[PDB]
Symmetry: D2
Subunit: 359 residues, 4 copies
């Protein structure tokens, strides 16, 4: 069977025929892969930045059900949930390994579990998300969008601590979000916050790209060039109710944006920072106490979040059609090894999502 | 009228006769002061660290209702809520200026509002908490305890974000709290978390005082001498579900305890740190993201929290009688000006609460 | 100005020119009506079955066009007004939520205290206007009825936070089953929305499905039960339900028939306004409700956040359920077509979902 | 081993010596019984209205016989009475009050031997620590737990209301009608007043001495409902919460439903024993229009037992007179005539009878 494989912690990636008998199976439903997605997580493991001699790569997949099984019909499109439980803790027991207490969960194509960059795999209906045929083209985004659905859900849950966090009209339309970083993660946070009605400012240390400019205009989102810091933003628009680090940049980015967090606000740490040490002085911390501010680490979406992502992706085909069409940057055939290895190894500037087509 | 007065931002304090006609009144009910309490906030304003020529000091008070008015009867003991709303924002409009969005609230004895260190004042029933005569002796603690009630309420609300944060028995008994600092605040956090059944470790850079040892033994609380850091605690007991900074220590304390925070955990920032700059490196912040950790600034209790505090103080007379008896360190007469000035200007080592008696 | 007017408590309805000076104004933004919707509440007032003025402007479902570029509203923007407005006194109205008004002194456009939106134009306050994307102009009128249902489902889900674990083995609510009693617009919208959220749905009515219902059933993978001879057969085959919605408007004895199908920890959601009958609840039934943590909840009125959520869902359905989405608007009647307009104002046709009025 | 035994569904009760080998064990901790409580459920089984036999009783305080992990010799403990089915997700998180299978056990009622026996073995997970400082009234933590859960659930449900708090951020302005003034009604009243809500107790007679004490000490109101509720409605108006604590004919609900206020909650806690109540379309439509809710309230679990302990401790200070009245009397296990009598029938105005093991 053709599979894209890695050998962690070593760097490297290969597309090669492997013995199906040694690959991980998870249930009774045979699924033939049609699309994989690639993200920075894949790039990390390929570059060695993170029994069996290898691991099947990939945690973003859409496949077709080969034979009808219980609720699933032949020809149905499905997406597997990538993080799976430890089987010990109560959070995993209720289907929520995003809050696993042991840290002994598996992550497909990353840790403990063969991923989905292979011709076909067997899975359990428990871990399969139904992808409507009507979103086959952009449906691969339901996996990354799921992490973002969970994050926004959690931020909203946490803000229930505030007696009234709604606005004069009972909505959240008056709440302002600063999304720091404009890769696929930043763009998806922006799309989803705007879907919920909150005001959004995207920030990056440059002018917008073509894709970003389309998102700006279509979603009625604001943009700030942060190249020379945030003073000018603070002075013009004031402070923000929510700030999202969609970075993975130097952690000093936090020192820059923390002064822009407003009373009762939330700083959501979603990016995985890769460098730096950020100093927080007593004046900054004292002020966080006085104003009921919160900092939250945000990670991993689960099945309900995948299902919510599907609904939102569907909505965006109507609401934000130009942005929706730009979510897929390009598609590489599994049979185009030179190009395939290229895109597995490194991101292109302004890339949103690269899809792998199985054919 | 005798009053304790300060003149911010300048240091200094005076006990003198002032013109009653110029003092702030808040409603129709005349209250004669019997007790005030003193805390670090009073010491700070007296020491110049934080229409009218002066401000009446003091935000912790019990008084007696001089004449019956609606629900309040002559002879009833009452305590005023100290932070009052800005009259503009939706949080203040629902009786919750602890979450004021404008920052234009008042704080008795600190900001905008004359406090309660004066022979009598007029207040509105809406801002008065009924103090049962059976807790007259320790009832003064309801004001500081209210901040702690609000804080624990808030932590427990935030933790609803975790699908299952309860234990195998449906309780929080398995959850571990590290209370850093053992002043009145640390002691009250410890008493209240033990009341709720969570396991508690108190930490300070020394061995326990006699009062702290009584609390330890009576409440079945653990203690850790953190003089040489937290490695030995971490190795023996592991990580904590909740960590409270009750310090008002250099912010580098956060650097010492953040590595002891467990998965899905909460760092509650309650103390107002007064020096230092703490570095947070990328490894620390990335781990916060991976594990759904949260940092929350905790401030100010409101009326429901004062009422809850009354119930808990009442409970502690039965549950923790020895600790309850040690909550009041000494009482100083309003007429003993030398001793009064002494205790207004500086804390005594091991002090929990000084009461001022009006007579 | 042309308006559709009624004179409660009397029956009757007229389309006539009325004095603009007489009609209620709510703010500074001039909005020109393009569409109205008609619902049962409108029918009831027209049939006479539901101070300072000789008449009331009918209608609480509307989409209008913004006449001038105001604050956050551009000329040509489509907007829908929120129909219930607060009492100005109570804490729930002061936070934008008169659905929970404590005084009962709220107003309801085209029903109670406030002129409706079946008129050429009206003035409104931006706070009460919901933006309707041009991309859903055709089905956007459904945002008003769907809002009541968004609120209702939101509330059911909030209430069920009482249950330590109401989610399923996979962390979803996919295993939860809903019985929606009654079809037509409300039942259909409840079914669409519950299916969007992933719960299993059975629709029930005392007959076989209409073509539109059949389309909804098949496209959304919903189940249907012919309840003509009661619910014994459903209970014996499928068992009990986690949520039951009364979308009836009929006799309250329907509740006697479906309460035996409510499962442990379940919610009976009362949304329809029952119009006849008395239902007896015996001690055995009530005791069992106590033993199983069951809840019965009165469900009423959506507010601005719910209107906004409805817009997103309606947009989603164009992709998820395109066949059903098209069938939501049964027909459009011109404001100028008087005989047809009076017909549709006075009576529902069998199988009707939504009739829209077009202002030309 | 001495034990109080019943043979459901048949009527009857005996105190006899029974083969210890036959009795149910639940864990490794040996607990020697000191007190039991008796309630209506006990009387029902005794009267045949609800192994060859079942050990009666689900209200117990026992003493830990040896020092175990977390439990010192001489410690007082109370067992949680309802235990899970081991299958469903609610049971698996320690909350069989919400069991989805109905295959839970209840000590001294079904599936599980009770605690009216000399001693039993239990699992530490099911034991609630009872402070020595509340030994005297501690037996009430079991019935109070059902009520702690009930109020918790009402407050959870009312989060659906955007603002259910008052002008001062409290619930002091919220009014509760507690219908029925038995041990349950009294405990509801005490707990709601502890939380600061206004309470009206109602019964179809004037108050007993004990009820009058609770009324006066807690500043609770009382309404004689002998001739219906119109007078109360005319004077006080409507209520935010109504608790049925009667166990009487369901037509009580028809009388009190018209007194429920906008956004209000009718809490069904009592187990009604007769009747049928008609609900007309006018009443039901009005419930829809005003966001009203009716909720079935049942069973407290471990966190609720622990909360009950704290509140009982608080009442020794807050409401000392009422607290001293919660225990009506104590009967020795060795006084068989009086013991059989109290197992078989409630005395008028009784709150709680305790059985002492000597
Ligand atoms: N927590 C979770 O569950 C989760 C899930 C998925 C991903 N992630 C993490 O989320 C982060 C973002 O993912 P991604 O795939 O969107 O990353 P990406 O493609 O690398 O994009 C990063 C974005 O940040 C911008 N940026 C870099 N430094 C900046 C700065 N100092 N200020 C403002 N913007 C700056 C970059 O600008 P240019 O476009 O000019 O390069 C780029 O637009 C990564 O750390 C990823 O690992 C977390
Ligand atoms: N957020 C709010 O609403 C709110 C309300 C009230 C008070 N506060 C703040 O809460 C903090 C505590 O108040 P308090 O009255 O208890 O203060 P306090 O009387 O000054 O007590 C401070 C405690 O921390 C101990 N400590 C100092 N450095 C430490 C370290 N490095 N590690 C561990 N313990 C250390 C002190 O030790 P020793 O006993 O050896 O001196 C003392 O026990 C203050 O900053 C106060 O301003 C906040
Ligand atoms: N709570 C709120 O905020 C709110 C808002 C809007 C509407 N409502 C109420 O919601 C209800 C439904 O509205 P609608 O506009 O959908 O009403 P509708 O057009 O009258 O439709 C009612 C449906 O119920 C069916 N039905 C009648 N008797 C039945 C029975 N015994 N069993 C099962 N189905 C039965 C009817 O069958 P046929 O199709 O064969 O006639 C029809 O499909 C009405 O009472 C309305 O006033 C409440
Ligand atoms: N849901 C649960 O988890 C749970 C837990 C424990 C108990 N319960 C049930 O809760 C109910 C109350 O328990 P309890 O032990 O307090 O019962 P109880 O001792 O029988 O007390 C019943 C009270 O209701 C009064 N009453 C009777 N009819 C009345 C009426 N029409 N109006 C007003 N009051 C009336 C009785 O009056 P008199 O004093 O004059 O007789 C008595 O005060 C019972 O049904 C019990 O089974 C439920
Ligand atoms: O491995 C950590 C995270 O990596 C991301 O790329 C995935 O989208 C998440 O599902 C995962 O939890
Ligand atoms: O002034 C800030 C804080 O000071 C503390 O001493 C009081 O207890 C708080 O209620 C107050 O909000
Ligand atoms: O019963 C009052 C209700 O009438 C319905 O027609 C409307 O859609 C609701 O918004 C309104 O609250
Ligand atoms: O309905 C059964 C109930 O009986 C009551 O007497 C007990 O206090 C509850 O714990 C139990 O759940
Ligand atoms: Zn990915
Ligand atoms: Zn786990
Ligand atoms: Zn103080
Ligand atoms: Zn304010
Ligand atoms: Zn309508
Ligand atoms: Zn109102
Ligand atoms: Zn009992
Ligand atoms: Zn169970």
């Amino acid at each position: 069977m053709k599979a894209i494989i890695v050998k962690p912690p070593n760097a490297g990636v290969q597309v090669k025929d492997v013995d199906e008998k040694k690959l991980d199976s998870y249930g009774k439903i045979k699924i033939r892969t049609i699309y994989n997605g690639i993200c920075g997580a894949d790039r990390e493991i390929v570059n060695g930045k993170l029994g069996k001699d290898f691991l099947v790569l990939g945690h973003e997949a859409i496949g077709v059900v080969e034979e009808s099984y219980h609720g699933f019909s032949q020809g149905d499109l499905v997406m597997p949930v990538n993080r799976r439980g430890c089987g010990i803790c109560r959070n995993c027991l209720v289907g929520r390994p995003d809050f696993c207490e042991t840290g002994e969960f598996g992550e497909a194509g990353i840790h403990k579990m063969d991923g989905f960059m292979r011709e076909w795999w067997y899975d359990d209906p428990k871990y399969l998300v139904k992808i409507p045929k009507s979103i086959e083209d952009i449906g691969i985004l339901a996996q990354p969008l799921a992490d973002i659905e969970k994050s926004i859900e959690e931020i909203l849950e946490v803000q229930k601590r505030v007696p009234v966090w709604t606005c004069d009209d009972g909505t959240l339309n008056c709440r302002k979000v600063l999304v720091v970083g404009t890769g696929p993660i930043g763009v998806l946070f922006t799309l989803l916050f705007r879907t919920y009605g909150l005001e959004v400012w995207m920030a990056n240390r440059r002018e917008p790209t073509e894709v970003e400019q389309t998102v700006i205009e279509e979603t009625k989102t604001n943009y700030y060039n942060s190249s020379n810091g945030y003073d000018k933003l603070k002075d013009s628009v004031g402070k923000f109710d929510v700030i999202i680090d969609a970075t993975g940049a130097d952690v000093n980015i936090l020192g820059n944006v923390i002064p822009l967090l407003g009373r009762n606000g939330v700083l959501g740490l979603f990016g995985f920072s890769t460098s730096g040490s950020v100093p927080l002085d007593y004046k900054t911390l004292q002020e966080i106490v006085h104003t009921n501010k919160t900092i939250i680490g945000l990670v991993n979406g689960q099945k309900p979040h995948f299902q919510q992502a599907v609904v939102h992706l569907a909505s965006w085909k109507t609401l934000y059609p130009k942005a929706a069409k730009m979510l897929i940057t390009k598609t590489v055939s599994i049979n185009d090894e030179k190009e395939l290895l290229k895109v597995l190894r490194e991101k292109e500037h302004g890339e949103i999502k690269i899809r792998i087509l199985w054919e």
